[PDB]
Design a protein around this ligand. Structure first.
Ligand SMILES: CCOP(=O)(OCC)C(=Cc1cc(C(C)(C)C)c(O)c(C(C)(C)C)c1)P(=O)(OCC)OCC
Length: 290
């Protein structure tokens, strides 16, 4: 090990939260939906760009051994480019509920004021959701293996690595991180002091730095040097790149939502779709429960 006692216990708590709130087999993801003027033309034309490189087919395995596969329609210029968004809204909403439950287990997060707990969740939800997706992603077949469900990227590796979120998943997977390293990335992402609407900048910054040092010292003392000499800094680089991709994808959601509303109420709150506690009643209730 080689970490202080505060540090070994800090990981213990994160790992615990991860264990209690991450459904790696997706056993409990049920009841989800499946497919069955000049100003506005530029809006639709930008949504096509927003959606075209994020297309997956869907595989769904049945208890009996049957397989249902779904290939999405090719872009014919109409509403058909939205066929998977209701299913994704349910998958992402299921994921965020787990992220919220993740944060509340953590003493340092729980000790923060409700309004700051909200702001931290609004800024980190996509990021922590995508870090969790990374651990079920298979880079050899381009597939997120989510228990009975599978999402495969449709062939069209050099054109894929153009979309920043897809390059991220490949780069991150290549690093071969430990469970403990993934969960530490989550904390560092969660306790970001310069999220919109955070009040206790000083406190959150102190907590983040405390988590980064634990990740830095975890790597020093659990990896053969100087092979992984810069793994910590690589991870920090990808956290920063992940903060940027979050913003881009949040703006994508809003453009799509503008012309084809589909976001769940929890998503509406998380991403600013229309008092910080009074404008986020679902989050507040989700945070005030046990
Ligand atoms: C705020 C961001 O929205 P969002 O959370 O939820 C939308 C319903 C988000 C969800 C998402 C993104 C990806 C990419 C980007 C890695 C391809 C996925 O592979 C997956 C699955 C479920 C297939 C694992 C889900 P979006 O980035 O990608 C849609 C595939 O949606 C933004 C428009």
């Amino acid at each position: 090990q080689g970490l202080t006692e505060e540090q070994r216990m800090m990981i213990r708590e994160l790992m615990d939260a991860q264990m209690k709130t991450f459904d790696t087999t997706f056993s409990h993801f049920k009841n989800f939906r499946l497919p069955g003027s000049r100003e506005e033309a530029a809006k639709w034309s930008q949504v096509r760009k927003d959606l075209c490189s994020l297309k997956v087919s869907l595989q769904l395995r049945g208890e009996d051994g049957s397989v249902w596969n779904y290939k999405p329609p090719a872009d014919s210029g109409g509403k058909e480019i939205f066929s998977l968004l209701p299913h994704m809204a349910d998958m992402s909403t299921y994921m965020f509920k787990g992220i919220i439950s993740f944060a509340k287990v953590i003493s340092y997060f729980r000790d923060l004021p409700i309004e700051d707990q909200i702001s931290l969740l609004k800024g980190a939800a996509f990021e922590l959701c995508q870090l969790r997706f990374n651990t079920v992603f298979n880079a050899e077949t381009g597939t997120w293996e989510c228990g009975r469900l599978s999402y495969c990227l449709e062939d069209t590796f050099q054109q894929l690595l153009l979309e920043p979120m897809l390059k991220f998943h490949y780069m991150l997977k290549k690093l071969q991180l430990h469970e403990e390293e993934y969960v530490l990335m989550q904390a560092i992402s969660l306790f970001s002091p310069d999220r919109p609407g955070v009040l206790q900048h000083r406190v959150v910054d102190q907590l983040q730095e405390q988590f980064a040092i634990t990740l830095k010292s975890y790597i020093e003392c659990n990896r053969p040097q100087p092979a992984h000499r810069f793994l910590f800094l690589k991870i920090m680089a990808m956290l920063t790149e992940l903060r940027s991709i979050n913003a881009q994808h949040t703006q994508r959601l809003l453009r799509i939502q503008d012309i084809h509303p589909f976001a769940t109420p929890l998503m509406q709150e998380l991403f600013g779709i229309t008092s910080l506690t009074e404008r986020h009643k679902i989050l507040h209730r989700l945070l005030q429960e046990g």
